[PDB]
Amino acid sequence: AVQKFFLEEIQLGEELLAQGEYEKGVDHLTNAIAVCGQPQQLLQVLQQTLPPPVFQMLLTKLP
Amino acid sequence: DAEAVQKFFLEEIQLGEELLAQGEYEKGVDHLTNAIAVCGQPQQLLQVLQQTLPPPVFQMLLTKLP
Amino acid sequence: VQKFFLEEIQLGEELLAQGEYEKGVDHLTNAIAVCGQPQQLLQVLQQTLPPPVFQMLLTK
Amino acid sequence: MEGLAGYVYKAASEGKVLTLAALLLNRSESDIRYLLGYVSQQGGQRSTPLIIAARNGHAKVVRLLLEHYRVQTQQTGTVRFDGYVIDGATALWCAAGAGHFEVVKLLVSHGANVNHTTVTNSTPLRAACFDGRLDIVKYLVENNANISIANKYDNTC
Amino acid sequence: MEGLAGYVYKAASEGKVLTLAALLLNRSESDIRYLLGYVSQQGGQRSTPLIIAARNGHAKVVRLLLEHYRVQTQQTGTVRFDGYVIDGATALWCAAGAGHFEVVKLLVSHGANVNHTTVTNSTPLRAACFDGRLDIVKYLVENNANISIANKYDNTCLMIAAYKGHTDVVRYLLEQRADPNAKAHCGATALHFAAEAGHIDIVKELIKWRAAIVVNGHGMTPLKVAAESCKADVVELLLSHADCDRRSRIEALELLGASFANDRENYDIIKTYHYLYLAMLERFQDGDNILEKEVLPPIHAYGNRTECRNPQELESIRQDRDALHMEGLIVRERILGADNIDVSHPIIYRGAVYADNMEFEQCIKLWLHALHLRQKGNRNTHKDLLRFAQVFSQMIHLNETVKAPDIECVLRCSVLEIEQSMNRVKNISDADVHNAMDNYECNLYTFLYLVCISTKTQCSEEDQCKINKQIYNLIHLDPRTREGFTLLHLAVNSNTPVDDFHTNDVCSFPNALVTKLLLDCGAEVNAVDNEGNSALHIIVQYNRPISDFLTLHSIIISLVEAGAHTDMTNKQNKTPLDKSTTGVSEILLKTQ
Amino acid sequence: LMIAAYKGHTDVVRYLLEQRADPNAKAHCGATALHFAAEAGHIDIVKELIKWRAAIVVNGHGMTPLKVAAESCKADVVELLLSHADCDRRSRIEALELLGASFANDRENYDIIKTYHYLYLAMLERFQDGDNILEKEVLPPIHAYGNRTECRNPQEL
């Protein structure tokens, strides 16, 4: 689940990112970051993968 | 038409949508080229298709339509 | 007065400088004589056009 | 290793970023470049994840590949799939042939090769002319690449 | 005439040819002669409307202007464009300065100054060479312009075209009997300038002419000036000419690789390691009478290890980019000295990477060498000092502690640079005196930013005594601003700008902590500005006595106790209580 | 207008007041287009309303917007309301008392010295005039807060 189930958690978020329900995409993304082995390195990665409205939902759900 | 062509039609619609959205226009249009060839109403679909693809992409489809 | 004639000899051939000399040179033919210097403005407009179009602007 | 290179090529050909980001996660630059140096033929034609990302048109993938990843535009790939499939393709050349102006200008601002000559010594400028994108040609001219690069048949853009 | 002069200007600047027909003609000749002579307020420049049409390349319009009244083709006018603001030369030069051949070919047959000079004595050949426009360059030498018109910095127009990548324009001057050996004021040659950008094609043309190859006025051979750059093709090209002696040819590739990863635009360690490895293998290739690097112990600021000795020794330090970047930088610190600007640039970039990679302890430590290296060359560090305070507030947000000797060494050299910045104004007279006026003023701002974050961050007592000495150093200097303020008056004023970075989160101007640390070292509490307002006058004019009253409460007791006059007046004859404009602020002033 | 004033979008706030929409549109809860701006220190939003005649008026509970500005420890807009229209010296003194009241007993704003200094500003203006002096109302001591009888002098403060 560190890398195997972790990949689909973004893929659930990525499809919901392409869907339009970004709040559900953040939920699958914030679970991936919670289970990621090194999610602190993804701070620069995840700060530009989303539209600017979606940044607020992601940052408020990580802690 | 219907049957296994219909599920093949919508698969080419969905995969043709993705590659066009992804950027693989050559494979995306070719995937959509099979969809129009198996489409139930290829002429009526082309009415909507005049506004779906960009005019360069629609012209790119127009070369592969026949 | 001459201000309108000078302005007509200033914007009458507006399309002529933009490429559309059909609507500019024809209007400049009447605008050349309207100005205070008919011979000078028509020759300058002929000079402003090509040497082959110099006769075209004057004969219009 | 090779399977990971196939995975990252499939991710870049589609356009996903997090999939190959996690495939490259906690890896040294050696195998990262090895996966990004996957110049092996797919479909019988040479292609590379950076090349196919430029061929795709997602500016995000190539902007991550140039800034936060270490891959160079000097690469071998296709220039025209239908009837040509000629090698020696720059990623900027691939974007110009595909026609994505945002990817083209991003690679130009990155510092990509603008005067590259392949085995047929063809330039991205004539690819942009072939695609009919005035904006790409305008960016290339404003960045002053060249005006007189010809083919083996001395074919000007 | 104001409206008619611009109307004649609008008859050539916008390319409208019919208005020029009705303006130069259809009227008198004496009035329009002044109108087409020059322009006054149109475009912020003083050129003839034909000249500003030559800037836009209106070939048909400038022909019509001459047909009515022959304007002086040698007449000059201001052209503010690329390459600083220029009081430009004649219209033929200006058309060459605009890179427009459509006006150049007309005026030469019409009669124009071929070798007309500019403010920086620029001939039209150089103006075309500045734009790198070949057909104008071909035309001036067809008009037999001088091929060696050297600049005020002794820059020949051949060297001017060598700044860019004009491999065809540069070689055309060579075809016109011009050897590439015209040294600049710093001895710069077209060989070195093409080597700066790694122009193998341009250098090969200079190799083709077979004139000469020699070091510049900085003592840098063309392979060495390319070595600090990131293009090994010039060094490889000079290897064909056998100008690369083996001592120089190995330090070339050692410098060439390291720059390819010690730059913001160029960051690649694979060719950086390989160029170091290939050169060190070439260094170990001698066998007998072996030659090695002159060993440099690690700088107390930059790094903690010396350079590698074996070719395979640096292979193990390739994994950690901090070690090999330093290893590739020690080999250029020994061969380029401590005063070279180009070797000082990788010092900042590594710390910028550490700031990007959250290595704030490594960023501040290794950036101390950047200030030290720039102090060796005796140059301004106003950008480097600002970047210290930006990261000093940045590491507070990450809550990484600073080193008190580290924050003192930057402060000690800052007032040394400020003294140099103060001397910089006295050094120059009329070149950039306004830039020098902002040079010393911004340096005090960075010191104010450096001091304010220093008070917020941890500092040892013995360093704080030396930290207060730099504050005590400037208070004896008493730097007077353009508005008459001093260092004491700078922190008191609430209108003092703060840098857009995290320095806003740590600066609380009016800063009571900065002002308290200024009075105990002898601040002029009775100093007067350009308007005569004292230190008590500036603080009492603050209109926010509620948001930051803690700053106001701590500064009213402090400033009044330093010896301020309660009945002091400015040049406008206003008492401190009268100019309060705030009841709460005046209450504290009246109490003290 | 109160929705935009609730957030930090001052551009919509300054634009909507110019659309012939009054800033005095008050909800029955108590918000009068400035109460909803007194939570996040919208210094720029209230700056527009002070210029646009915000027409200071209490909420449903009777608390003034000056008190509501002090309720969020936003001293940037406390100064705006204090000098706007009438000075109202009666609430000017107690505004600093209320503003510093939370600064000792709030999780978001814990500045013990600012609690003293804001009361000091209140006590400064309370006895600066000399004659026609003003004193705090003598509430009975509350056993929860010890047995104090407020700070009616700067000496005990």
Contacts with D72 from chain E: Cβ below 8 Å = 268
Contact assessment for residue E501 and residue E390, using Cβ atoms and an 8 Å cutoff: yes
Q: Encode E458-508 in three state secondary structure.
A: CCCHHHHHHHHHHHHHHHHHCCCCCCCCCHHHHHHCCCCCCCCCCHHHHCC
Q: Which residues pair with D42 in a beta bridge?
A: D45
**DSSP assignment of E22-90:** HHHSSS-SHHHHHHTT--SSGGG----HHHHHHHTT-HHHHHHHHHHS---TT-B--EE-SSSEE---B
Cα(E382)–Cα(E375) distance, integer angstroms: 12
In the structure, do chain C and chain E come into contact, i.e. share 3 or more CB pairs under 8 Å? yes
Residue E369 assigned as binding residue: no
Q: Omega into F23 within 30° of 0, i.e. cis?
A: no
Cα(E581)–Cα(E559) distance, integer angstroms: 19
Contacts with F125 from chain E: Cβ below 8 Å = 583-584, 587
Cα(D7)–Cα(D3) distance, integer angstroms: 6
Instruction: Tell me the CA distances in angstroms from F25 to E60, E546, F32, one per residue in order.
Output: 64, 29, 6
Cα(F9)–Cα(F1) distance, integer angstroms: 10
Residue F28 assigned as binding residue: yes
DSSP state of E284: G
Q: Do D58 and B23 touch (CB under 8 A)?
A: yes
First CA to last CA across chain A, in angstroms? 20
Residue at token pair 């906690």: D26
For the four alpha carbons of E42, E46, E50 and E53, in that order, the dihedral sign comes to negative
Residue at token pair 């790094």: E303
Resolution in A: 4.1
Nearest-Å Rg of the Cα atoms of chain E is 31
Contact assessment for residue F128 and residue F122, using Cβ atoms and an 8 Å cutoff: no
Cα(B60)–Cα(C29) distance, integer angstroms: 49
3-state percent breakdown (helix, strand, coil) of chain E, nearest 5: 55, 0, 45
Cα(F78)–Cα(E547) distance, integer angstroms: 8
Cα(C10)–Cα(F65) distance, integer angstroms: 63
Closest listed residue to residue E63, CA positions, set C44, A58, A46, A30: C44
D33 at interface of E, judged by CB pairs closer than 8 A: yes
Contact assessment for residue E96 and residue E133, using Cβ atoms and an 8 Å cutoff: yes
Cα(E437)–Cα(E442) distance, integer angstroms: 9
* CA closest to D61 among chain A residues: A49
Residue at token pair 């002529």: C16
Contacts with D81 from chain B: Cβ below 8 Å = 26
Cα(E7)–Cα(E49) distance, integer angstroms: 10
**DSSP assignment of B1-66:** --THHHHHHHHHHHHHHHHHHHT-HHHHHHHHHHHHHT-S-HHHHHHHHHHHS-HHHHHHHHHH--
Q: Which residues pair with D156 in a beta bridge?
A: D150
The amino acid present at E84, given as its one-letter code, is Y
Contacts with D57 from chain B: Cβ below 8 Å = 22-23
Cβ partners under 8 Å of residue E318, min gap 6: E269, E273, E324
Burial group, residue F18, by CB count within 10 angstroms (0-12, 13-18, 19+): exposed
Q: Do B22 and D58 touch (CB under 8 A)?
A: yes
Residue at token pair 């701590």: E554
Contact assessment for residue A24 and residue A53, using Cβ atoms and an 8 Å cutoff: no
Of B15, B25, B27, B30, which to mutate for an interface test with D (greatest number of D Cβ within 10 Å)? Answer: B25
Cβ partners under 8 Å of residue F80, min gap 6: F43, F46, F47, F50, F69
Closest listed residue to residue E6, CA positions, set E57, E43, E31: E43
E322: Cα separation from own chain's centroid:
28
Residue E39 falls in which region: left (phi positive, over 0), alpha (psi -120 to 50) or beta: beta
Q: Do E270 and D28 touch (CB under 8 A)?
A: no
Query: Residue F136, SS3?
Result: coil
Residue at token pair 């980019």: E321
- Phi first, then psi: what are they for C49, rounded to 5°? -90, 180
**DSSP assignment of D35-102:** HHT---EETTEE--HHHHHHHHT-HHHHHHHHHTS---S-----S-TTTT--S---HHHHHHHHT-HH
**DSSP assignment of E324-336:** HHHHHHHHHHHHH
For the four alpha carbons of F49, F53, F58 and F63, in that order, the dihedral sign comes to positive
Cα(E199)–Cα(E138) distance, integer angstroms: 21
Window 79-118 of F, Cβ < 8 Å to E: 79, 82, 96, 99, 111, 113-114, 117-118
**DSSP assignment of E155-173:** -BHHHHHTTTT-HHHHHHH
Nearest to E319 among D28, D33, D70 (CB): D28
Cα(D25)–Cα(E547) distance, integer angstroms: 48
Cα(E78)–Cα(E97) distance, integer angstroms: 12
Residue at token pair 């085995």: D119
Length of chain D: 157
Cα(E166)–Cα(E201) distance, integer angstroms: 9
Cα(E117)–Cα(E126) distance, integer angstroms: 10
Residue E218 assigned as binding residue: yes
In the structure, do chain C and chain F come into contact, i.e. share 3 or more CB pairs under 8 Å? no
Buried b (16+ CB within 10 A) or exposed e, F98-115: bbbbbbbeeeebebeebb
Instruction: Tell me the CA distances in angstroms from F8 to D18, E267, F46, one per residue in order.
Output: 33, 40, 11
**DSSP assignment of chain C:** -HHHHHHHHHHTTHHHHTT-HHHHHHHHHHHHHHSS-HHHHHHHHHHHS-HHHHHHHHH-
In the structure, do chain B and chain C come into contact, i.e. share 3 or more CB pairs under 8 Å? no
Contact assessment for residue E55 and residue E92, using Cβ atoms and an 8 Å cutoff: no
Cα(E371)–Cα(E364) distance, integer angstroms: 11
Residue at token pair 């390739």: E318
Residue at token pair 């941890």: E458
Cβ partners under 8 Å of residue F62, min gap 6: none
DSSP state of D148: -
Tell me how crowded residue D154 is: count the other CB atoms within 10 A of its CB.
6
Structure tokens at E182: 């015209």
Closest listed residue to residue F141, CA positions, set F130, F151, F154, F131: F151
